[PDB]
Amino acid sequence: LSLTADQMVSALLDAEPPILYSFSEASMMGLLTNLADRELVHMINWAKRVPGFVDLTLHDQVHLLECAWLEILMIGLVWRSMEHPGKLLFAPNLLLDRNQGMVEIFDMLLATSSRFRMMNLQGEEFVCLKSIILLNSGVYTLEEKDHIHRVLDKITDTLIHLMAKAGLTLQQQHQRLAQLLLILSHIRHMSNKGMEHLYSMKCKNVVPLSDLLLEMLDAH
């Protein structure tokens, strides 16, 4: 809670995970689940560098990541797809259109990409939103909760700082803050649909699911 907004933004920028490389339907979802497993390991490293997160107990860290992991994967996928209208950039070597899709989720992901592009979402705003997803999505499921809300308030201050620096009026700042946070409702929705699809894949025992992903499903 001591960082400046600018130090907050630079801390989150430096913590960004790398972009990794990756057709039957058994084969495509093999690629997606294999990619998701590898991205999840890098996610853990990023989570440990989100300010405030290391202050939490290991069990609170586990709960928050178990709740938010697919939302975090999903907003990360939307963000790197933003400059590829109509397509999802799963990896630099896995750029997919909707006919290749799953389709219900694909369309929701494309709609979010389109919304981000219409708002001209900035990378500094994106890393704030990703950190909010991590701290918020499991907070509703006592000194520890107050710490998480104090950190969440700091990230809101940071988002507002960025829009002020960008020259937005107060009214525009508040409107854009609201537009950004409302998208998180849609990301929650997509993650719930993606989780339920991943449970169906687990049940039919065809797609190779890593131990790690399997326990993320168990947690849901």
């Binding site: 853990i44 989570a47 440990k48 290991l58 586990v62 326990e215």
Partner: peptide
């Protein structure tokens, strides 16, 4: 579990 070991 695994996530514990990874953090």
């Amino acid at each position: 579990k695994i996530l514990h070991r990874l953090l």
